[PDB]
Amino acid sequence: GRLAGKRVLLTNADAYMGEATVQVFEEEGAEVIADHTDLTKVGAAEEVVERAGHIDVLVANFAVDAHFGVTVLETDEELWQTAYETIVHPLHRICRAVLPQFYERNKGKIVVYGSAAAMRYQEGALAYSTARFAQRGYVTALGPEAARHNVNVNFIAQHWTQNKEYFWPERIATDEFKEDMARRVPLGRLATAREDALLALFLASDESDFIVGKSIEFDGGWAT
Template sequence: MTSRMTGKRILITRSQDYMGPACVEMFSKEGGDVIADESDLNTEAACRKVIDDAGHIDVLIVNLAAPNHYGVLVTDLAEEDWLQTFELLVHPLQRLVKHALPPMIERRKGKIIVVGSATPLRPMGRLSAYSAARGAQISYVKSVGVEVARHNVQVNLIAQNWVENPAYYPPELMENEKFLKNLKDQVPLGRLAKPEEDAALALFLAGEESDFFVGQAIPFSGGWAN
């Protein structure tokens, strides 16, 4: 039986971070030719090289992570931390998409999936830089998604929170009683999502069943942000 990604080439950025490992596993399991890139994406040239080296790309998964500096008051936020958050989450997004889109537009087929965050969908204090950068990702995807839809290229974002991953939920946090109580209080489902549940949504957005999804930020947070 043919798997869902058979014959597809999938580029996953920062594949060792955030939701990269789960997506690599899911798309490989589904028969995709997965390019698991681990490059630093801190310059325009580096982003262009990743796209050029990958060659033909059917699906681009823009997976980016950054420290969230949670708990820091906006008046105490260091300038370098503000700038670094945008350097890690926003600028690479534009650079990767800019270089990946032309071949997709030319052949009138392609999928771009951004692994984002639900934090901009629900106001949270002491999270200004991260919320702003993740919010910029959402606005970017909405604009670009509408722009390229006429070319039969779909650009969407997974607005996630409360999903198991080493970047934001390390093992030691999962043993913290205060965190576990907060999890049950904040998330209607009362648990974290499994990485494979999140990757399954990315898989759906990469398939033909999602062709009518355009520029959407889809909440994936167990009811925390709807």
């Protein structure tokens, strides 16, 4: 097993990419703590880790409505703030909580399921895009700092990937979605959740200790 003997902490395990992570990571021998705690609440992250015990890998799995099609002028205070409360501030909270034990053992792995909208313009997703950009920046600024304690932190800039929040069955069925994907995605298809978790498995494994603070675009060529 490529994660044999590892204990993995997965945030919001029922949302976004959690289901495929559990399935892939367990079949590679990991013990996956599938947490369901709302990490927008101050203090919650410190407790999840406390109750978790020994963590080898943190899979920071956060998602929020992109509000596709909402314009800049329609991006009101609540919508803007909710993007940050939901995927930005919790990211630092939960990473801060795991790092002490990582630093104790001079070893650790963090994988962030982010978005290729943090790499390049995605139309109609303003507040959301800026929040993923901030996630991306967290990995860019933390990666090399944590690398000094032999901790890897990396960012999956995913897009066109099966999940409820962004590519739900109703959306991907329309003629309009299929024409737009064909124009914009060179590979011409969506990724499966499993393919996403296979990249994360690499980034969570000890096969990837030399990858630090990087954004790997998981997008079928979209941002190329």
